Structure 1
Amino acid sequence: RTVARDITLLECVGKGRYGEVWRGSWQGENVAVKIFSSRDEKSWFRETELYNTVMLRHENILGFIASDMTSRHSSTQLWLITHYHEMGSLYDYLQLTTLDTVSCLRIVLSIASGLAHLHIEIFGGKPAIAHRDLKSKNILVKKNGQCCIADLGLAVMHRVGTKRYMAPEVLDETIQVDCFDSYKRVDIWAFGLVLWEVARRMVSNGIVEDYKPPFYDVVPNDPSFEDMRKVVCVDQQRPNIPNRWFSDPTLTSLAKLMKECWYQNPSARLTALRIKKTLTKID
């Protein structure tokens, strides 16, 4: 039989230290192709090892198609091939889109749904998985208004995370490194920050905040580890809740939720399953 492997790369939709992401075409269909830099080969290996262990399939997890290693004269070429989401990342989308109540809740409940699927051990199934780099750039927007979580290159099964999104126990190096629940609680902190990023873009009473990243008002661009530790650990700052949220029942409930993702004590934070239940009871 014929095995048609050729993927046509059509346009670059992302370029970074990680490497590049391309829109590509296979058998008439869009795919996304991540081409890894030599510097980030371990992310390809980790994601590949995870998908070789458990073929994750969930509407709120970026859909795996293939992992390819190709021999070159003096290098190895590493590609990850996934479903393609033409609307791009949540980070992108929030820059120049505002949200209504239904669209804001749909976005955050879909993220919670994908995160709970990662976190839960299923017997018979899947190991429990912590993401370790959850942020708005690692979430894609689907045409149906739900999102999906991307990038399992740092994931752990039962490179460091993006510093802006690191929980206090990562910054002060007190995290219980041998304890798997610790890694779930790090993801919940980062989820709370994403929830704040999204909520800001939800209109109420004709008011909306501009897109900003978490801690935009207290750290520089590309904040250092120390910059983050002073804000989050020493001063124990948290993102601002605008007064206008307290006129809106949805944003009032979301503020409460994000507070319960940001406790200094990791074991006080809500679980992804409890976040889902809370979001299903809002509106």
Structure 2
Amino acid sequence: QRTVARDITLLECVGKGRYGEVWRGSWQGENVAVKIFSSRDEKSWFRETELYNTVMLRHENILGFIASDMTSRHSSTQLWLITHYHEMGSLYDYLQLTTLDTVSCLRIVLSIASGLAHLHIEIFGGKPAIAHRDLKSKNILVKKNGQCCIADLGLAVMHSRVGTKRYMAPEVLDETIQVDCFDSYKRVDIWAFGLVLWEVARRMVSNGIVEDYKPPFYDVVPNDPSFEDMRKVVCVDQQRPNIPNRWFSDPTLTSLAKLMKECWYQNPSARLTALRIKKTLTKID
């Protein structure tokens, strides 16, 4: 009645960590991305699989799902997540070398805001509201058309492993987050979005000037900062990323500085919503 061609050829490893590995693969002559999970991070595969079994997200700024595969091995279970492949790689990767102009900077950040607002919004008929819980530049991929997409729903929570410590909001670091209020999780994503917006804005040229790529808080915490390192910076001293003087000569960067400030309020309920961020970004330039 029909052949079901399941063979995926793994061609090149494009990422390896404690999570496991990501591979460029081939299925029926087309590139796919294959995430192979470590034993240590099986729950990330289960959570993303459970979410996609609940709602088949389809959005230009969400990494495109293809498949979740569990295969029985002699002494172990093998877990793969198969997605669209974005050959330009992560935003983290891309910003290291590349500088941006006004149009490319805005296109990047508005595409991220678009993906994030899609996750956050409940649609009746539709989708549950979704918070990401690990938004960062390594979890955003660059597409050839200049838009980005959001990746890795292994920590996501639906309404109707913990986050990367460098990007944790103050209420996560001081353990005051209202864990029974779904809006709490959206506001944690907004904080992290503001940090990503800062990372990208630094790489936008104005008046012949650009900042070097740096991760958020590069100047105040070590590599692999501890919870305590982050809590002292963000909660106790209430530091925020630096806005360089040169941004205030450029109307786009002046507007982006204002926006990122309104993602970083200590009071989570004062932060902008993803929908409000989108509207603000459509009115810039």
Q: Equivalents in 2 of 1:38, 1:219: separation in Å?
A: 30
**Deviation, structure 1 residue 124:** 0.8
CA deviation vs aligned residue, 1:102-154 (integer Å, no higher than 9, x gap): 00000000000000000000001000000000000000000000000000000
Indicate the SS of the match to 2:22.
strand
**Deviation, structure 1 residue 45:** 0.0
**TM-score by structure 2 length?**
0.99
Q: Does 1:114 align with 2:130?
A: no
**TM-score by structure 1 length?**
1.00
CA deviation vs aligned residue, 1:18-38 (integer Å, no higher than 9, x gap): 000000000000000000000
Q: Equivalents in 1 of 2:239, 2:130: separation in Å?
A: 28
**Deviation, structure 1 residue 79:** 0.1
Q: Which residue of 2 aligns with 1:240?
A: 242
Q: Equivalents in 2 of 1:233, 1:161: separation in Å?
A: 17
What is the root-mean-square deviation of aligned Cα atoms in Å? 0.1
Aligned with 1:161 (options 154, 160, 163): 163
Indicate the SS of the match to 2:78.
strand
Q: Equivalents in 1 of 2:7, 2:169: separation in Å?
A: 42
Q: Equivalents in 2 of 1:4, 1:58: separation in Å?
A: 26
CA deviation vs aligned residue, 1:30-54 (integer Å, no higher than 9, x gap): 0000000000000000000000000
Q: Equivalents in 2 of 1:211, 1:93: separation in Å?
A: 10
Q: Equivalents in 2 of 1:233, 1:278: separation in Å?
A: 28
Indicate the SS of the match to 1:125.
coil
Q: Which residue of 2 aligns with 1:13?
A: 14
Q: Equivalents in 2 of 1:177, 1:185: separation in Å?
A: 12
**Deviation, structure 1 residue 59:** 0.1
Q: Equivalents in 2 of 1:240, 1:185: separation in Å?
A: 21
Indicate the SS of the match to 2:74.
coil
Q: Equivalents in 2 of 1:74, 1:265: separation in Å?
A: 49
Indicate the SS of the match to 2:45.
helix
**Deviation, structure 1 residue 251:** 0.0
Indicate the SS of the match to 1:230.
helix
CA deviation vs aligned residue, 1:163-200 (integer Å, no higher than 9, x gap): 00000000000000011000000000000000000000
* Structure 1 unmatched ranges of 5 or more: none
Indicate the SS of the match to 1:278.
helix
Q: Equivalents in 2 of 1:125, 1:85: separation in Å?
A: 26
Q: Equivalents in 2 of 1:46, 1:179: separation in Å?
A: 20
Alignment of 1:109-188 (within 5 A): 109-158=110-159, 159-188=161-190
Q: Equivalents in 1 of 2:219, 2:135: separation in Å?
A: 21
**Deviation, structure 1 residue 162:** 0.0
**Deviation, structure 1 residue 73:** 0.6
Q: Which residue of 2 aligns with 1:31?
A: 32
Q: Which residue of 2 aligns with 1:73?
A: 74
**Deviation, structure 1 residue 230:** 0.0
Say how many residue pairs are matched: 283
CA deviation vs aligned residue, 1:49-95 (integer Å, no higher than 9, x gap): 00000000000000000000000010000000000000000000000
Runs of 4+ in 1 over 6 A off after TM superposition: none
